[PDB]
Amino acid sequence: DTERPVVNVPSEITVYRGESFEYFATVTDNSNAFDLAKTVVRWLYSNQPGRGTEWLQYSVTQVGNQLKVRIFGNVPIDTTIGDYTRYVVATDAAGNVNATQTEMGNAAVDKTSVNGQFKLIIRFRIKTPENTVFVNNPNQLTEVEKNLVREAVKKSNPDLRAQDVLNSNYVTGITVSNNGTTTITYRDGRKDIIDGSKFIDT
Ligand SMILES: [Ca+2]
């Protein structure tokens, strides 16, 4: 047995602050025999969930000739928004691994991928304002009205901190168009858009 086990894991695992998550990976091997205790989910440097993502949990079972790796946890309300490279590293009974420590290191530095590699994305779960913002012209808000909109979005999303948005500044990170459509750009460059028509009226 020189054939390595193969992990099937989604390319992105997206989790939301203040919520639980649950995803699965699968492992197969020509031998159908595994070392479950040496099948882990980890960051590059050591067999650990990783700095900043200490809440990333996993558990492994065997179902027929495959492993199922449950990837789960509870995301703190104030963990950093952004993404991380993580790895499912599986071992077969013969000791073959899907990705070696050296391969993981090359992939990290070169920005290439190994089998079992996934991007862990921490997102904010945006909420549309509950209370309507009343404006004189819904197709052309005043600057005073756009600031009311920013305030409403901040009040409807109280766990969104200044350090969570672009440039760590609410004014740069939460931008309002002429019709009140609001883009929230997070510190990682990802964006959520709230269409003005869902909370703006005349
Ligand atoms: Ca094998």
Residue numbers in the entry: 399 to 600
Structure paper excerpt:
Many streptococci adhere to protein-attached carbohydrates expressed on cell surfaces using Siglec-like binding regions (SLBRs). Siglec-like binding regions (SLBRs) are among the streptococcal adhesive modules that bind sialoglycans. SLBRs contain two adjacent modules: a Siglec domain, which shares some features with mammalian Siglecs, and a Unique domain13 with no close homologs outside of the family. The conserved sialic acid-recognition motif governs general specificity while sequence diversity in surrounding loop regions allows the SLBR to select between related sialoglycans.
SLBRGspB exhibits narrow specificity for the sTa trisaccharide, as have other previously-characterized members of this evolutionary branch. To reveal how similar SLBRs could include or exclude different sialoglycans, we determined crystal structures of these five SLBRs at resolutions between 1.0 Å and 1.7 Å. This included a structure of SLBRGspB with improved resolution as compared to a previous report.
